Design a binder for this molecule. Structure first.
Ligand code: 1QV
Ligand code: ZN
Length: 258
């Protein structure tokens, strides 16, 4: 059992190889909006993506990653609850088989159709493999998707998916501007958590935006035509690649907004 989402290797099995799955600071979590406390000490986030250099899109068998050049400080996330500078390395999504499910975080138990994660690492640790071993090593910006109007800045991602249908396929993906994926408002909730796939390391400051972005039915239908399987293997549609909410334990979710 290499892990996945399937009928026999999904999230409820992961603890057998990755015992941290039952740890004290796992992600994702349900955000109870009545219990999250406004923290007037939190700053506006700084999303600095003007110089972002996208390179490649890859179907890794679990999702697809849009990869960036993080060999210098092009695209960075700073401020909000963060100290120091976090470099963008990739974004990816989680989504469902239908619009009623797909997000990993939930909001008062509401599940959104999908969730985008912009993954960043703390440059004080020099590289990503080092950063994931530190409690403050990563900052993941989480943005919910709901189905409604098309998102114009998502269409270049949708259009390339037919070329990376199966696991291990990749394609060029230069000059993509991730600012086209942000909502209007940067209001957010934040809490300390983890990677949501194995190895599930507890190295993430989560920053989850309150305002979802809207994508069209047609756009999310194309996500659901991807495959978990490799070329020539029996087809396993890449859908429901999300981990369910985990116990909040001894953690406080803070709101940036009153
Ligand atoms: N699903 S997630 O929390 O956004 C997320 N997980 C992981 C992960 F487990 C890794 F090993 C890794 F190198 C990543 F870049 C991410 S990014
Ligand atoms: Zn993710």
């Amino acid at each position: 059992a290499n892990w996945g989402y399937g009928k026999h290797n999904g999230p409820e099995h992961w603890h057998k190889d990755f015992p941290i799955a039952k740890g004290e600071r796992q992600s994702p979590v349900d955000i109870d909006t009545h219990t999250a406390k406004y923290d007037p000490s939190l700053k506006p986030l700084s999303v600095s993506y003007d110089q972002a250099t996208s390179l490649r899109i890859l179907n890794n068998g679990h999702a697809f990653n849009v990869e960036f050049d993080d060999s210098q400080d092009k695209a960075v996330l700073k401020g909000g609850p963060l100290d120091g500078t976090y470099r963008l390395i990739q974004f990816h999504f989680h989504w469902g088989s239908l619009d009623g499910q797909g997000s990993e975080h939930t909001v008062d138990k509401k599940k959104y159709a999908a969730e985008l994660h912009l993954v960043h690492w703390n440059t004080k640790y020099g590289d990503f493999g080092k950063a994931v071993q530190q409690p403050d090593g990563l900052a993941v910006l989480g943005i919910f998707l709901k189905v409604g109007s098309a998102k114009p800045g998502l269409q270049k991602v949708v259009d390339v998916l037919d070329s990376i249908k199966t696991k291990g396929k990749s394609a060029d993906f230069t000059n993509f501007d991730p600012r086209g994926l942000l909502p209007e408002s940067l209001d957010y909730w934040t809490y300390p958590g983890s990677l949501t796939t194995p190895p599930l390391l507890e190295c993430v400051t989560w920053i989850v935006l309150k305002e979802p972005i809207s994508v069209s039915s047609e756009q999310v239908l194309k996500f659901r035509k991807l495959n978990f399987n490799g070329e020539g293997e029996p087809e396993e549609l890449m859908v429901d690649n999300w981990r369910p909410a985990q116990p909040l334990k001894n953690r406080q979710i803070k709101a940036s907004f009153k």
